[PDB]
Amino acid sequence: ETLNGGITDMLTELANFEKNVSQAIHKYNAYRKAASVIAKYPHKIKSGAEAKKLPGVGTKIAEKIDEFLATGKLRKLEKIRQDDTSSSINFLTRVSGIGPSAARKFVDEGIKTLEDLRKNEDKLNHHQRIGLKYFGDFEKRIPREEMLQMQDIVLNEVKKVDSEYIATVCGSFRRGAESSGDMDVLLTHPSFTSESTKQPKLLHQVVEQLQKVHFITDTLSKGETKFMGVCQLPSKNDEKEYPHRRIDIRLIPKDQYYCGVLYFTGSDIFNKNMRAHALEKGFTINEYTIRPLGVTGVAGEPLPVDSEKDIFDYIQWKYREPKDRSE
Template identity: 25%
Template sequence: MMPLKRRKVSSSTGAASTSDSRDDAFKFPQVVVFLLERKMGSSRRNFLTELGRKKGFRVDEVFTESVTHVVSEKNWADEVRGWLSSRGHDSTAAHLVDVSWLTESLSAGCPVCVLQRHRLTERPASSVDEAAAFSMPVYACQRRSALDHRNVVFTDALSLLAENAELDEDAGRALAFRRAAAALKAFPEPLTDARQIRGCPCLGRHSLRVVQDILEDGTSHEVEATRRSERFRAMKLLTGIFGVGTKTASEWFGEGIRNLSELRRSGRVLNRAQRAGVTHYDDLTRAVTKAEADAVARIVEEAVGAELPGARVVLVGGFRRGKPSGHDVDLLITHPQEGLEEGLIPKVVARLEARDFLLYHKSSRKSHTEASAAPACPASSMDRFERCLSICKVPTPEGRDDGALGGDDERGRCWRAARVDLTVCPFSQFAFALLGWTGSKLFERELRRWATHEKDMSLSSHALYDNKQREYLQAATEAQIFAHLSLEYVPPSQRNA
């Protein structure tokens, strides 16, 4: 196939005369749009230009006196005027609008009225100094994020929008909201004015608009509308079922299933994990406390110790970062003598089953080797250790731990169901696995991004590979991994990005 030829851009006079001669080809000749490439980028500008023309809008390649709407993205009004003025253009007769005006017009099929929220705002006089004075590293792995921070109302709102985007399988939008929330978690003071975060990384216009709405109205109408929406509530409930992902939940939602009662009446054939998830739904959607997690760790440690004396069992995930509760219990297992840990999971599972501790389990074998993982294969965010995903009977504080956890009477049982994940790793990979399984998810993602883009390395829960030197970098502790990456060590309690 012959490649498409790039369309030539004519001079200002030629472009204007061509556009004028084609006024009758546009649905709305009285509206002439010019897209400012500054901060928007050529690819996005070209895409919006073609889309606008397909919808019947006149979009000129160059600025002329005929332009009625100058559309830009992530610019202040004075920046746009200055940019145009430096090229000899007078923009006083044109509307200076945000790209949201264009997208809303394209959705409506006609130019919408320019409202105050569409107009570009002037850069506050103090914002330049504030932006210069306020400095925050771009990568979340360069920042310290404690559990207790001062901007919960904003981060909760952004996190809800991120969750909704994830349920819609819009990974890019979800990540943008997650990064914005992470930046505000690390912000050192309570946010009372949007000017405080001018220059703050990872805060795009959408996130800033949510922040501004909360500052002005005490809430975000978009967030509240999302929280109340039928799809969000149904998808959140359905994906809360153990063994159900967003794709399956979306299919069920499309079939009219909104809750467990409708799922049961639908006649859908569920797999073994999903049946267990429905059976124990109330327990599994209730937070696991630190006391309950510690009780699970003791039971698993006893079973592991009986099979492999000297093995180490570590409670990881949010609990290692200091969280008082979580949605599951993650335990990482290793042994100082490498190789003895292989095949441990089936033996531990057999002991836990004999104790009537398991309600459901599924085990997977180790599938990672250095030869298969690198250098040809890049590091993955998903590890390939020997593992058991399970639902267990967790002793409740009022229950007795007498070596057996029987008793299925709901009125007087001494246990509750909870998700418990067991992962076994070789001792040489323990530091990497410990770092990867501690989280938070965004912190780990940013660590891998930093390794790739800033250090030309590949980081996973198995290893750190230097692509320049073409060798693995050994590490016995998390601190050594941070040192390899030229990063200041961040303790687990400060990794809550």
């Protein structure tokens, strides 16, 4: 956690670099187990060898260790960090929509900068177009103060269209979070569950409405169950306009809301931990349901859930408010 810090650190630096600049999934994949392990190791690793003893730690990595323990540096790391080429790849990458593959490609073509990114807006797909567009506003945090406004709104329309829709703004915001990266609305409806062959319009109506009133200003990807866009709160009585925000809304078969909600609510560890728990308690929990476990090793049969509670009850736990789902 701190004792093995630098090690795993350059380690992740290293892996992340393969997979991005290089198409070296393996080596990249290497660096990670190693980093994974040394990370777990209970003692200050003092030299290649020591480390070396570990599963996943080869002569290659071990080699880097020493260099690193001897000199609090690494050439490859010093050389990469410099590399204008791989710098570019790391950078272009931030663009919402740009990934390594494309990061490379642009680079090759010679699109290194954001300005390059502009002059060549043609070479970019819509995703990335918007991605380039709201580049600033994308990178910014979302004041809870604003979250409340946004949430306030979504809620309204959702209801306006059909009183029957149920909505939940999940993620950190739900968990208290003084800020947030983007809003996650989870949605469901009674008419929609496990069997009943969809009703695509379900998602649809909603989006249409959101845009209807001008909340959603763009579409990143509307699909039959996952919309993915951009929103913005009405810029009041001018002088101060609102930053474009990522928004995601997903339709859910009513008979799986809570688990999903539970899930998306996090935190990542509370989740795990909870998950890890359901298990001893003789169960299974995942993004959509919760199943009683059986001795033969495994089992099925999706237990009924009416609220975050039910889930808790099941594994017989203490109801924990979103606020304290921190871990």
